[PDB]
Design a protein around this ligand. Structure first.
Ligand SMILES: CCNC(=O)C#Cc1ccc2c(c1)NC(=O)/C2=C(\Nc1ccc(CN(C)C)cc1)c1ccccc1
Length: 312
């Protein structure tokens, strides 16, 4: 209805995949590269008074450039809509994975968990928090690598639950502790059939420790699942934790391996736009999160996954 016209120059829309909170999520294809993307759609009239909060939050997400975070490619604002185009993760949720395998071994949990820690550390290093860590918000890519999305009650920290002020970073550590327990046990540490009983169990902080957990596992859970947020392990101490280090002998590399422009991607854009190299480089370097940014980031992802850097 005219809000979709600009978008439909660049993307072919596939199926809705998520009628989430404030935003519809559609699957789509970027025409020029033929790459699948996820498109978050919001209506500006129903955001109303929140429209500035969101526009500002969108600017924070532009800086989230990290191998274990789903990347933002394109922001398009029309008269009535905001469209956000995001990195597609075909592998589905970690939630699905844990159900299929029942529970992960300590060794496999460790591989999974270092990736989460990696991304969460990066987020906190930029002065942000995720605030909603759970297996539904962690996706696998085609190489079985984890990507964080969506910047529930079972994973929420005691202070958050009481409606007190809370530090995002501290709440993220509690939530990762619940994630850790779920990965290794195959079930929640705190569960109940009504909200009040659940809230109470979370506040009391007592949970069962299954007899298959290693002493090292038990200890790391005890450092993360501390009802008093002050008593919780710091990010610093988590990246170099003994359990984290087991079978690896180096700490979690959390800093972004993502950049300087990639010469193959620039070449292919210069060819397509019939430009000099230096002209394309200047234009890409504006980083407007327009169609050019989108195409560039999608070629950079074809490269990163070994594919050829080509436009149609
Ligand atoms: C900038 C920081 N990042 C963000 O804020 C973000 C994000 C975000 C959110 C969601 C997705 C994403 C990125 N990429 C994706 O591929 C997403 C979805 N993929 C997805 C859906 C269905 C199947 C199942 N198929 C078989 C239909 C697979 C895959 C997805 C959509 C809705 C719910 C769960 C996942």
């Amino acid at each position: 209805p005219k809000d979709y016209d600009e978008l439909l120059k660049y993307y072919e829309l596939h199926e809705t995949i998520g009628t989430g909170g404030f935003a519809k999520v559609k699957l789509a294809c970027h025409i020029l590269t033929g790459e699948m993307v996820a498109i978050k759609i919001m209506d500006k009239n129903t955001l109303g008074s929140d429209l500035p909060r969101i526009k500002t939050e969108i600017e924070a997400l532009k800086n989230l450039r990290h191998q274990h975070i789903c990347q933002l490619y394109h922001v398009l604002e029309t008269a009535n809509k905001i469209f956000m185009v995001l990195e597609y993760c075909p592998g589905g949720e970690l939630f699905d994975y844990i159900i299929s395998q029942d529970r992960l071994s300590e060794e496999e949990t460790r591989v999974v968990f270092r990736q989460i820690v990696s991304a969460v550390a990066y987020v906190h290093s930029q002065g942000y928090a995720h605030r909603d860590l759970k297996p539904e918000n962690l996706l696998f890519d085609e190489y079985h690598k984890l990507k964080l999305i969506d910047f529930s009650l079972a994973y929420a920290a005691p202070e958050l639950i009481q409606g007190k002020s809370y530090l995002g970073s501290e709440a993220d550590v509690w939530s990762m502790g619940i994630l850790l327990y779920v990965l290794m046990c195959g079930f929640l540490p705190f569960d109940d059939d009504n909200v009040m009983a659940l809230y109470k169990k979370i506040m009391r902080g007592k949970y069962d420790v299954p007899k298959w957990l290693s002493p090292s596992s038990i200890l790391l859970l005890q450092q993360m699942l501390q009802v008093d947020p002050k008593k919780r392990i710091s990010m610093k101490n988590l990246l170099n934790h003994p359990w984290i280090m087991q079978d690896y002998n180096y700490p979690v590399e959390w800093q972004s391996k993502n950049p300087h422009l990639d010469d193959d991607c620039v070449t292919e854009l210069s060819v397509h736009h019939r430009n000099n190299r230096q002209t394309m480089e200047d234009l890409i370097s504006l980083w407007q999160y327009d169609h050019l940014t989108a195409t560039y980031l999608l070629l950079l992802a074809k490269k990163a996954r070994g594919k050829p850097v080509r436009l149609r």
